[PDB]
C-alpha cells in the first residue's frame, strides 16, 4: 500500500539510499493517485539526489577531459567515461519526465501542484540541456523554457509573491536564463523582481513557511549579488 512505500522512502532517505527512495516514490506515483505535499517533496528529494550524483560526476569528468587536452590516451578515456555518466543522467531525467507526463502533470488538480510539477519539468529539461549535443540542445532548451514559463504564469496568477513555490520557481528560472540561455540581464531582472515583490508584500509571509520563503529570498539575492558584481 501507498503509505508503506512512503514510510519506506522516509527510511531510505535517512539511510542516504536515494535509489531505494526514488524507487519507492516512483512506485507510489505509478499507482496514479494525486500526490500529497509530503509525497511530492519525497519524490523530488529522491530524484534530485539520484541525478545530482551524476551531475557532479559529469562536472568532475568534464573538467578532467578539458585539462587533458594534448594528452591523447587520457583525454579519450575521460571522454568515454563522461559519455557513460551522460547516458545514466539522460535516463534518470527521462524517467522523471515520463512520470511528469504520464501521471503528475495530468492529475494535478491544484494550482500549487501544477506549478511545482511544471517547475520540475523545467528543471529536468535544464539538466538535459547541461549535457545536450549541439544539435539536440535547441529543442531541449525550448522544452525547459516553456515548462518554466507556463509554471511562471500560473504562479503569478495564483500565488502570493512570498509563496515558497513561486520564489523557488523564480530562482530556478533565473538560473536557467543565466546558465542555459546566457542572458544575465534577464536572469538578474527575474531574480530582482521576485525578491523585490516578496519584500514589498512581506506581511503575506505565513508562520508555517516564512523560513522556507526567506531562505529562497537569500538565495535569490546571493545570486543577484554574484551576477551584478
Amino acid at each position: 500500500d501507498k503509505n508503506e512505500l512512503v514510510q519506506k522512502a522516509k527510511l531510505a532517505e535517512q539511510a542516504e539510499r536515494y535509489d531505494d527512495m526514488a524507487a519507492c516514490m516512483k512506485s507510489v506515483t505509478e499507482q496514479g493517485a494525486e500526490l500529497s505535499n509530503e509525497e511530492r517533496n519525497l519524490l523530488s528529494v529522491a530524484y534530485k539526489n539520484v541525478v545530482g550524483a551524476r551531475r557532479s560526476s559529469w562536472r568532475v569528468v568534464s573538467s578532467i577531459e578539458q585539462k587533458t587536452e594534448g594528452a591523447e590516451k587520457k583525454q579519450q578515456m575521460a571522454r568515454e567515461y563522461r559519455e557513460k555518466i551522460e547516458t545514466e543522467l539522460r535516463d534518470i531525467c527521462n524517467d522523471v519526465l515520463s512520470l511528469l507526463e504520464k501521471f503528475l502533470i495530468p492529475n494535478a488538480s491544484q494550482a500549487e501542484s501544477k506549478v511545482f510539477y511544471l517547475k520540475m519539468k523545467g528543471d529536468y529539461y535544464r539538466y538535459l540541456a547541461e549535457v545536450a549535443a549541439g544539435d539536440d540542445k535547441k529543442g531541449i532548451v525550448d522544452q525547459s523554457q516553456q515548462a518554466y514559463q507556463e509554471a511562471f504564469e500560473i504562479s503569478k496568477k495564483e500565488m502570493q509573491p512570498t509563496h515558497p513555490i513561486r520564489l523557488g520557481l523564480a530562482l530556478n528560472f533565473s538560473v536557467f536564463y543565466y546558465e542555459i540561455l546566457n542572458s544575465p540581464e534577464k536572469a538578474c531582472s527575474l531574480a530582482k523582481t521576485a525578491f523585490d515583490e516578496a519584500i514589498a508584500e512581506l506581511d503575506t509571509l505565513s508562520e508555517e513557511s516564512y523560513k522556507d520563503s526567506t531562505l529562497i529570498m537569500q538565495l535569490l539575492r546571493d545570486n543577484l549579488t554574484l551576477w551584478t558584481s
Binding site: 528529494v45 523557488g168 530556478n172 554574484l226
Partner: peptide, 8 residues
C-alpha cells in the same frame, strides 16, 4: 563548484 545556486 558552481557559484550561483538553484533550489537545494
Amino acid at each position: 563548484k558552481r557559484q550561483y545556486k538553484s533550489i537545494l
